[PDB]
């Protein structure tokens, strides 16, 4: 039984494939245990720790992530892994735990960049040039 899931964050798209194995989680082929920085590693690891050791050491996950930055890719992989785990075990209690801990693991993040505008564009939609007044 091979299960596929998707996660999206900003411009980061992650496709996660989960199957039966020993507990090998790889992000782009590189083990999750040596993810740098620790901030991104913790973001990726949180859902597995929440699920528990038993489920963690019972599935193998391979995640391919493209686009975004080192945090966007990590969060997209987090979402994909959370969804894959939830759909694989089919545990409503686990889904409820995930929802109470962080609604965003299963539900995506709609937030995107707001297009820039004139009057000192290239800085932000609302950033404006200083006015002389005299």
């Amino acid at each position: 039984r091979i299960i596929q899931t998707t996660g999206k964050r900003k411009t980061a798209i992650a496709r996660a494939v989960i199957r039966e194995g020993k507990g090998r989680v790889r992000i782009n082929g590189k083990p999750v245990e040596i993810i740098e920085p620790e901030i991104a590693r913790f973001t990726i690891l949180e859902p597995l720790i929440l699920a528990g050791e038993e489920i963690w050491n019972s599935v193998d996950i391979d995640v391919k992530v493209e686009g975004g930055g080192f945090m966007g890719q990590a969060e997209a992989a987090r979402m994909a892994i959370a969804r894959a785990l939830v759909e694989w075990t089919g545990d409503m209690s686990l889904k409820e735990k995930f929802m109470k801990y962080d609604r965003t693991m299963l539900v995506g993040d709609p937030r995107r960049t707001e297009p820039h505008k004139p009057n000192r564009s290239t800085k932000g939609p609302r950033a404006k040039r200083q006015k002389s007044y005299r």
Partner: protein
């Protein structure tokens, strides 16, 4: 165990130490009097930076191979301090990369793919994989979570 199971820097330093033995990889006569890119302010502070650079180039050919001088230069470029002007990104020099790749080819770790670039040969692949396996065996003791991999 392979390259993908080992941190890049810990593997690169070990590969440099091992490559110091091979006689086909020697610093050029102009190595002591050169910087590593027009964007760099001061020349290296290692006295053996040649082996580290060659190891990095070999690992790059292993991972993203086939590749070429221009793309490796893009990788090895970086930000420059232009003074009062805003900072900007520039590429790196080409002689260092070209000589490193030629020395690797002479050693037999890389080979030319015509019109595409340079790709790692089985000999170099085995060399890198052996170094990575040794490093992973060393690391497994500190980090038990890497045993299953």
């Amino acid at each position: 165990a392979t390259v993908y199971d080992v941190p890049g820097d810990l593997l690169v330093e070990r590969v440099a130490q091992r490559l110091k033995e091979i006689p086909e990889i020697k610093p050029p006569e102009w190595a002591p009097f050169v910087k590593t890119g027009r964007h760099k302010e001061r020349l290296p502070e290692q006295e053996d930076w040649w082996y580290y650079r060659v190891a990095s180039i070999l690992r790059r050919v292993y991972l993203d191979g086939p590749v070429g001088i221009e793309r490796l230069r893009t990788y090895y470029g970086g930000r420059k301090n232009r003074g009062h002007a805003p900072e900007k990104f520039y590429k790196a020099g080409g002689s260092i990369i070209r000589k490193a790749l030629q020395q690797l080819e002479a050693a037999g770790f890389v080979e030319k793919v015509p019109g595409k670039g340079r790709v790692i040969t089985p000999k170099g692949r085995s060399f890198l994989d052996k170094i990575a396996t040794e490093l992973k065996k060393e690391l497994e003791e500190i980090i038990p979570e890497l045993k299953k991999y």
